Structure formats: C-alpha cells, structure tokens
Write a structure and sequence with these properties.
By secondary structure, the protein is mainly α. It contains nine helices and four strands; from the N terminus they run H-H-H-E-E-H-H-H-E-H-H-H-E. The longest helix has 33 residues. The relative contact order is 0.15. It binds 13-beta-ethyl-17-alpha-ethynyl-17-beta-hydroxygon-4-EN-3-one.
C-alpha cells in the first residue's frame, strides 16, 4: 500500500512459522536437542531466504557463505524476539508454536540465565513498540552486520547493499515518525542493533560449551548446525572478526 516496495518484498519472502517437533517430559537434554533441531530447520530457512533477498546473490559466493555463518545466531534470537513480542506480548519466549517457554520450564540455572538475556530483545520490542516494517529492515542489517577483518570479496557491492537497507529502515521509521522524533528513533533502533553484538556473544559462548560437551549432556547437534558452529564460532568468540557499529 503506502509501504515502500522493498519492505513489501521483505514481507513476501519471510518464511512460514517453523515447528521444532517437540513432544510434551522435558529434561534439559531433550529440551536442548529440540532447540538444536529447530535451529537446524531455521538455518535451512535462512539460506533459502538469503537467495531471494534483493542484492544478496550478487555478492561473491564466499561472501554469502561468510555472512550467513557469521549471523545465523543473531538472526535466530532476533526473530525469537519478534515472535515473542507478537504472539505472547513478550512475556514468554516463543521459539516455535510447539515450543514456548515460561519461567517454569527453565529449571537449570545457566539456561534460565541465557533466557533472561535473550528476553531483553522482546522486552525492547514491547517498549519501543517495534513495527513489522522496522523489524524486517533491521533483520537484514543483522545479516550485513559483521565482516571479515580483511574485508569481503565484493566489499563495494556490500557497502552499497548495506546503505540501501539503512535508507530502507529510515523509510520504515518515516512511516510513523517528525524530524527530531524520527532522527531520535533512528538512534534508538541502530543502538539496539549495536547492543546485539555483546548480546550474541554470550549465546555463542554457551553454544560452543554445550557443543564441546554434547556427549556428557547427551545433547545432539545436527549436521548443518554442527558445521557453522565448528567453522566460525571459535574465531568469532576470540573476536577475530569485524563488528559493524552504528555508534
Ligand atoms: C540452548 C542453547 C544454544 O546452545 C545457545 C544459544 C541457542 C539458540 C538461540 C536462538 C534460537 C532461536 C530459535 O528460534 C531456534 C533455536 C535457537 C537456539 C538453539 C540452541 C542454542 C544454539 C545452538
């Protein structure tokens, strides 16, 4: 309608809701395994999605692969925030329609602590009242929010691609926002993205530790998920990548 074309395209390429396949007898092991399964399924959707994402397929194949493997985590927790904020007013973590967790289902300490950290996103969503339009644009920026220390092969086309999406976000902010109020809401939304780097870092550490101890904890990791983890997680944890900040 009165909504910009690219934002409309972004909405059309958003995947259908993904189920985890959970049963429900939730042990910590059966819960983590279900979360890795849902992740495996989300990874597939991310990749298929990036192929319709305007501008993405025009970057080097190496670059497409690097950006995906660098951002899967941030993307999955950011979309967790949306679903949570949208279906249960952000007061419950809506991983999937068959895997929604309240405070009672988070028995183990470390696990409840991880959840409390992810919960910050849907809480900001409820607070700033993030829009469907703003969300879609921000999700794309996250895909383009970290690059190799030495840069990307198609760096120029990447920088041009990222600017279009920053301009697109401003368009979505202009849908509801004034000059100072719009300029202020821009500061707010790009600061939120900035704060995700630090947020995703804790999820990474918890993930790699759970992966490395997958035998003991009896927690299974699928093939595609095991690959991105093994291929990029350690490097990222060691801070051997370049985070793109707005502030
Ligand atoms: C529990 C656990 C973890 O190990 C640490 C952070 C976690 C992820 C955080 C975000 C996420 C949102 C979803 O909607 C699908 C499952 C995924 C998660 C699966 C399990 C992880 C990554 C493998």
């Amino acid at each position: 309608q009165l909504i910009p074309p690219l934002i409309n395209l972004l909405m059309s390429i958003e995947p259908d809701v993904i189920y985890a396949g959970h049963d429900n007898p939730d042990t910590s092991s059966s819960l983590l395994t279900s979360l890795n399964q849902l992740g495996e399924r989300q990874l597939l959707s991310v990749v298929k999605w990036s192929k319709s994402l305007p501008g993405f397929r025009n970057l080097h194949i190496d670059d497409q692969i690097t950006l995906i493997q660098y951002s899967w985590m941030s993307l999955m927790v950011f979309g967790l925030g949306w679903r949570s904020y949208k279906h249960v007013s952000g007061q419950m973590l809506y991983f999937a329609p068959d895997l929604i967790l309240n405070e009672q289902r988070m028995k183990e300490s470390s696990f409840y602590s991880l959840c409390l950290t992810m919960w910050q996103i849907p809480q900001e969503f409820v607070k700033l009242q993030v829009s469907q339009e703003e969300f879609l644009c921000m999700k794309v920026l996250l895909l383009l929010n970290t690059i190799p220390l030495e840069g990307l092969r198609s760096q120029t086309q990447f920088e041009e691609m990222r600017s279009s999406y920053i301009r697109e976000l401003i368009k979505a902010i202009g849908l509801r926002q004034g000059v100072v109020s719009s300029s202020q809401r821009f500061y707010q939304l790009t600061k939120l993205l900035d704060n995700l780097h630090d947020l995703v870092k804790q999820l990474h550490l918890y993930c790699l530790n759970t992966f490395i101890q997958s035998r003991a904890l009896s927690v299974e990791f699928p093939e595609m998920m095991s690959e991105v983890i093994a291929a990029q997680l350690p490097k990222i944890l060691a801070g051997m990548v370049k985070p793109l900040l707005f502030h």
